[PDB]
Amino acid sequence: NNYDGDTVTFSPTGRLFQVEYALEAIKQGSVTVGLRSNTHAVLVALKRNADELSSYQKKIIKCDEHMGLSLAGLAPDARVLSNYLRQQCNYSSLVFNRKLAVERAGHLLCDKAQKNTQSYGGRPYGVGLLIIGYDKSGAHLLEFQPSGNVTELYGTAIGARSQGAKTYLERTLDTFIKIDGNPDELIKAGVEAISQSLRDESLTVDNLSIAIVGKDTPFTIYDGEAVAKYI
Amino acid sequence: MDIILGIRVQDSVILASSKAVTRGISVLKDSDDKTRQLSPHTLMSFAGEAGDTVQFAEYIQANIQLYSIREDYELSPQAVSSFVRQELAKSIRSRRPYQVNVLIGGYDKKKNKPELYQIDYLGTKVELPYGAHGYSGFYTFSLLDHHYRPDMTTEEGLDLLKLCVQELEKRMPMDFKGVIVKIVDKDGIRQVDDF
């Protein structure tokens, strides 16, 4: 009310309203799902269009050969954060000849988002990210929120009606976690998960967006006729 | 760049500047005009380091032309020469100084008098009846000391100038390919085409 003019102001109950309004931008964004087993990690994203004449907004971005994310909310903010991740992954490779740990990737994003919530003039990032990767400790899935909070998960979902997919994964947890050495089945579980967040619309060939990374699989994105298999 | 001469007579200033542009063992050009018009009644000749000469001349030209537009008024030769000197005086203590020597021949319309200023790359200004830069002066000064008179006409000044060029063509080691002569008077600046 009187405490939402900028990010530098606390409310009387200790809330940061600009951060909460940034969180609100994610809820309006199109649904995207993340889940992993022990061998692979999968991103599934429902892309959104302006109208039938327009293209479908690309949700998934590659950060390195072993890491990438999906976005929900302000796409330009995802571009800034993904670019930062690309540089950090790259710095780790050039300087230390070392693939960046997915956990450090999350710590770096957390700290970058945080600085924007404590200083005057700036604004919080208006996007949520689901980071997947495969590093020296196996497969990983992270959930980034622009408040700064990063959380490692077996599976999750963000965006509009994400609660449906999140409930499904909470039920299916014991099943999909053990899908080891089988990419197509892990994707199927992710495609069935995102289907629980659909209303009136269904998954078409230029609507669905899938990405995967794993043990002997570089981070690769599937769009167009390459996802027709999973419909 | 080598030979630039200046002679102030009764009612005009005459500048003579060599036409040769030499690089190494090759005369690249024999029709080079080593001068810029700073204003309708002010002319500046120049000589020195390659590149610096033209870059400096045009920079001054732009500044004087800017002043003329702003004030709708022509700066006096004295004022222009003081501006030029200050620029060179700044330059000599810069990271890379302009290695350019200039003569400024102008006609002051308020005083109705011709004026010749000699300024070297250090920012050393002097008003003179006749001037020269480089090795030219080692011949022409003594020659002009003898033959020059303050009440001479423009035509007498041109004959006096011919006497300088002839001496330079006789005793100078390098072939400077003749000179372009320009006259500055009450009616402005004009070029002598046959010299």
Binding site: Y120, G121 | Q78, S82, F83, Q86
Partner: protein, 244 residues
């Protein structure tokens, strides 16, 4: 952040006016009146000191009339402290010009630069404008005797006779009535004092409440002299015109 406390000094009103410039002019309208009158053989500067106290040291005082160089002077109306900032800048600018061209600065060039500084404070920087209006009196070999005025907007204009400060409306009407083009300095001196005497908010105009100056070619042969009047000299000129 700090946005909360920003007055926004350099913005337009809905009517297209600059708030701070208008309010600075309102401030100047309460300042002691200053009059400039340009004659064919010189310029007169006359200014009324702001409600003088009897214990004020009058002879070693300078409130209204300042010297910029040997050929140019100014009469001030508004905040004196603001004026002195601008005066020192103007003095330096005149010396920069002399150093560069070996010639005394033309009056308009000095006025334009000083007015450009004022303009800057109205368009950028977020600072309040200078609450000062000047009357420039000066001479050069191009235009001869010249009178200008500048105000907080940074706009300047040339005049034959002009007033700034308090009661300019009444003062300008009186000047417009009695001024003529073939006027002499001595006549202009009389007009300046008569105008102040009528427009003043004081009971009677006296020597101790005035500053006076002339810029004549009254020196020996083709050269300009600046005369900042002494208290006794103002006392004499006030008697000579029959005001006291």
């Amino acid at each position: 952040g700090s946005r909360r406390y920003d007055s926004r000094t350099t913005i337009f009103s809905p009517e297209g006016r600059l708030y701070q410039v208008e309010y600075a002019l309102e401030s100047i309208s309460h300042a002691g009146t200053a009059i400039g009158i340009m004659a064919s053989d010189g310029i007169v500067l006359a200014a009324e000191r702001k409600v003088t106290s009897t214990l004020l040291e009058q002879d070693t005082s300078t409130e209204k009339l300042y010297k910029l160089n040997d050929k140019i002077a100014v009469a001030v109306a508004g905040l004196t402290a603001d004026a002195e900032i601008l005066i020192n800048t103007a003095r330096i600018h005149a010396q920069n010009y002399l150093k560069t061209y070996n010639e005394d600065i033309p009056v308009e060039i000095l006025v334009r630069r000083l007015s450009d500084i004022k303009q800057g404070y109205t368009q950028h920087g977020g600072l309040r404008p200078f609450g000062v209006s000047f009357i420039y009196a000066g001479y050069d070999d191009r235009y001869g005797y010249q009178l200008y005025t500048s105000n907080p907007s940074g706009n300047y204009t040339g005049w034959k006779a002009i007033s700034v400060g308090a009661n300019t409306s009444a003062a300008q009407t009186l000047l417009q009535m009695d001024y003529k083009d073939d006027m002499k300095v001595d006549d202009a001196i009389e007009l300046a004092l008569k105008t102040l005497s009528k427009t003043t908010d004081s009971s009677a105009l006296t020597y101790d409440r005035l500053e006076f100056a002339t810029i004549r070619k009254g020196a020996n042969d083709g050269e300009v002299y600046q005369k900042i009047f002494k208290p006794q000299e103002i006392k004499d000129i006030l008697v000579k015109t029959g005001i006291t």
